[PDB]
């Protein structure tokens, strides 16, 4: 199998750990771990090629120790948090491109299921905000030079497989 290292970064609580666990175990977690700490390698097949994908979780609140030899980056925000999106160019892209200057980035909008959630929309409206729109994610992907923009929901599994398929294709370049 082809072996590739993936590192996932982004604001705390934007769904990184749940995304990794739903992809690798096909089950939304019932217990809380800040970062995946065991069994970090998942299999995936892309265009006939077997690829082993090592999944490196991070705390988004030492962290640069995860960056060496990375083959692809998942840079995440949450669709229920316009603030987590604004931290993409202000915090995460400067850090990732410093330690991983030419590693491909997939920009990922997590928690897609909350875009139409009424509690989410009510909480954001009291701050004069609304959920991130897909056109905003695409614009940000252009801004930071990401290989692609993907939306997903770890809760519903919608788009999860596609995120990692796109990341693997980017890593194989
Ligand atoms: N509604 C919804 N909640 C999610 C989703 N993914 C993760 N979460 C919730 O969001 C919280 C933070 O998730 P976590 O993966 O630990 O975030 P991390 O700090 O970025 O690793 C937790 O309460 C999760 O249950 C999702 O896709 N949809
Ligand atoms: Mg986590």
CA distance linking residue 148 with residue 141, whole number of Å: 6
Q: Which of 50, 8, 45, 52 is nearest to 154 (CA)?
A: 8
Q: Find out whether 9 and 60 touch, Cβ atoms under 8 Å.
A: yes
Atom of ligand 1 nearest to the CA of 21: 15
CATH number of the domain that 132 lies in?
3.40.50.300
Which of 168, 29, 19 lies closest to 106 in space, CA to CA?
168
**DSSP per residue, the chain:** -EEEEEEEEESTTSSHHHHHHHHHHSS--SS--SS--S--EEEEEETTEEEEEEEE------GGGG-TT-SEEEEEEETT-HHHHHHIIIIIHHHHHHHSTT--EEEEEE-GGGTT-HHHHHHHHHTT--PPPHHHHHHHHHHHT-SEEEE--TTT-TTHHHHHHHHHHHHT-
Query: What does the buried/exposed string (b/e) look like for 23-52 if buried means 16 or more CB atoms within 10 Å of the residue's CB?
Result: bbeeeeeeeeeebbeeebebebebeeeebe
Q: How many domains does the chain have?
A: 1
CB 2 within 8 A of CB 172: yes
Sign of CA dihedral 50, 146, 107, 137: negative
Question: Cα of 80 to ligand 1 centre, how many Å?
Answer: 11
Atom of ligand 1 nearest to the CA of 29: 25
How far from 142 is each of 33, 59, 105, 113, CA to CA, in Å? Answer: 33, 25, 11, 24
Rounded Cα distance between 140 and 3, Å, is 29
Report the C-alpha gap between 152 and 159 in whole angstroms. Answer: 4
Residues around the ion ligand 2 (C-beta < 5 A): 16-17, 34
Pocket test for ligand 1, best of 58, 154, 156 (most atoms within 8 A of CB): 154
Q: How far apart are CA 24 and CA 22, in angstroms?
A: 6
Binding-site members for GTP are 10-17, 28-35, 57-61, 110-113, 153-155
Domain assignment of residue 109, given as a range: 2-171
Q: Please work out whether the CB of residue 154 comes within 6 Å of at least one atom of ligand 1.
A: yes
Answer left, alpha or beta for residue 56, where phi above 0 means left and psi between -120 and 50 means alpha: beta
């Amino acid at each position: 199998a082809i072996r590739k290292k993936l590192v996932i970064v982004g604001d705390g609580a934007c769904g990184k750990t749940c995304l990794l666990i739903v992809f690798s175990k096909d089950q939304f977690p019932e217990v809380y771990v800040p970062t995946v700490f065991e069994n970090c390698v998942a299999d995936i097949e892309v265009d006939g090629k077997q690829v082993e994908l090592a999944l490196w979780d991070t705390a988004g609140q030492l962290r640069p120790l995860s960056y060496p030899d990375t083959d692809v980056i998942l840079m995440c925000f949450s669709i229920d948090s316009p603030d987590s999106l604004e931290n993409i160019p202000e915090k995460w892209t400067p850090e990732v491109k410093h330690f991983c200057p030419n590693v491909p980035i997939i920009l990922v909008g997590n928690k897609k299921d909350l875009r139409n959630d009424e509690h989410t929309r009510r909480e954001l409206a009291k701050m004069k905000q609304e959920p991130v729109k897909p056109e905003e994610g695409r614009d940000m992907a252009n801004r930071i030079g990401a290989f692609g923009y993907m939306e997903c929901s770890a809760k519903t599994k919608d788009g999860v497989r596609e995120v990692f398929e796109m990341a693997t294709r980017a890593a194989l370049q």
